[PDB]
Amino acid sequence: LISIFTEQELELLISGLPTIDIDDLKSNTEYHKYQSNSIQIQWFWRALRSFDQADRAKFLQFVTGTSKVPLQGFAALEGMNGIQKFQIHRDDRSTDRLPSAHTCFNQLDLPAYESFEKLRHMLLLAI
Amino acid sequence: LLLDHEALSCLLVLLFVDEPKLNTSRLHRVLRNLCYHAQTRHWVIRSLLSILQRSSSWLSVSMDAALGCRTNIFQIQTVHIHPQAAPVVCRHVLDTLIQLAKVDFWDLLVKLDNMEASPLGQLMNMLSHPVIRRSSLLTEKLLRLLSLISIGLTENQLQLSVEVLTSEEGLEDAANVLLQLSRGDSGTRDTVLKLLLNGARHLGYTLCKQIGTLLAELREYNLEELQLPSMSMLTSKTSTQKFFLRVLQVIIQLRDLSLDELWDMLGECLKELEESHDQHAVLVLQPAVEAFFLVHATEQKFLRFAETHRTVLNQILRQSTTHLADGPFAVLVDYIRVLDFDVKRKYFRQELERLDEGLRKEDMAVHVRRDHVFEDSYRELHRKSPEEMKNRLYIVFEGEEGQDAGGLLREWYMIISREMFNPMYALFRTSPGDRVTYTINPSSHC
């Protein structure tokens, strides 16, 4: 009966769905090979805004390794070596592979998916 | 022979006169007691059934039937009942017959005025006759009667038309009739199953016509909220969807229908509703989906369906109050990727309550010290049973004032979930990578 939840969903069942201040995350995002006005990033923010609270939480778990929202806000987002902001990296590998995460750096490698719909589909399939 | 046929005829004349005051349950119990005598029963029933067939001065009984029309119930010229009064004579006779099923008259009647299993065939023929076939009430009562009595081909056709055409209780009594008949004979089982299938195929064909108009009109709606008028004849309480699902639920109840033109166009219709950026707009096809998953996913193809419409079937289930693990969509319990998180959470809590529905839960005290809550709770509970844990815990801190128990419970859970991560208990340690998470302390053997 507990096994109907995923390993994500069990966290969301015990600790609850978080409220994600997308403005705090966006204010505390670091872009490495994308830029804040890249089209894949505007697609990212549109997708993540269109995702429900549970898929947002699954994204936070995907990139930080947890659904826990920092009390102080994402400015206080910890990584392995002190406060590490969330971060989006362009994955220069083939764009037929899912994004990949290195949560100790809060690091996303994100292929340059050709469209909003396709990027959204791949991200939702990842989470 | 306690009473003669003239005294029985005088009692039976009371069924025609519609008086609200008259105690007709007492009259039914008089006829019931008299009908313990087999010859009296046989004449009484043969007369009541002649009253039904003839529905389909002492005898001057004026019933107000309609506006400006006060009919005489009896037209004597060979005695006929005026069709305005007929539905009431039918209603009172079926009320009496339901009790006699739990347990010449005309010539006698004019002589006054001048001064179980065999007739089941007549009661099945009665369904063809217009005053009954019109009235949902008389149909419901006659079906209740047949459902009691049941404890040929045309007569089953007329019983099935009661489902293919227009009463949920009366049609569940019709389901009971059709089942209890199938219990009778393999030949009546077979003929009624195959004629159900014939009607269900007609219903499927016209349902595919209706959904084909709906889909076409959704194309014409997009190519330039949803109130497509083709939707009205699906929203309708008496829609072919509900007839089709009803008939299939009876077929599947008798098991203990080839329509890929329907199933694939329900498919592309659902896909074109979902692409049309409206959500409750799907629900006008929920009973056709439930029929699909009834006929398929027999107690695969339903899984590819639930995949290509996954978020749609989730919208269906989330909207539905049908209990996920008691309704038809229960089969997908084990293929869990096909449900939403909060749907699975609801299923969790309902299935949990189903498994634990037998336990009466009490309130139960837990006496703890603000500085020791963790160890006092451990001492109190760690030998307690699961069912003692399942009681509603209320926590008492020594000498503290009374306060709201809900806030006090929230505080108690918060303090415990904190004390879990005090290293003095050695239960959990932070991940050296994340440094905010917690996993079992491998140094808890201390």
Curated annotation (Swiss-Prot), chain B:
Tissue expression from the record: Weakly expressed in heart, brain and placenta but not in other tissues. Expressed in a number of cell lines, predominantly in those from colorectal carcinomas.
Taxonomic superkingdom: Eukaryota
Residues spanning the membrane: none
Family: Belongs to the UPL family. TOM1/PTR1 subfamily.
Subunit structure: Interacts with isoform p14ARF of CDKN2A which strongly inhibits HUWE1 ubiquitin ligase activity. Interacts with MYCN, POLB and CDC6. Interacts with isoform 2 of PA2G4. Interacts with NR1D1. Interacts with AMBRA1. Interacts with HAPSTR1. Interacts with HAPSTR2. In hepatocytes, interacts with PAQR3; the interaction promotes PPARA poylubiquitination and STUB1-mediated degradation.
Clinical disorder: Intellectual developmental disorder, X-linked, syndromic, Turner type: An X-linked neurodevelopmental disorder with highly variable clinical manifestations. Common features consist of moderate to profound intellectual disability, delayed or absent speech, short stature with small hands and feet, and non-specific but recurrent dysmorphic facial features such as macrocephaly, microcephaly, a broad nasal tip, deep set eyes, epicanthic folds, short palpebral fissures and a short philtrum. Patients may manifest other features, such as hypotonia, seizures and delayed bone age.
Domain remark in the UniProt entry: The HECT domain mediates inhibition of the transcriptional activity of p53.
Protein name: E3 ubiquitin-protein ligase HUWE1
Species, as recorded: Homo sapiens (Human)
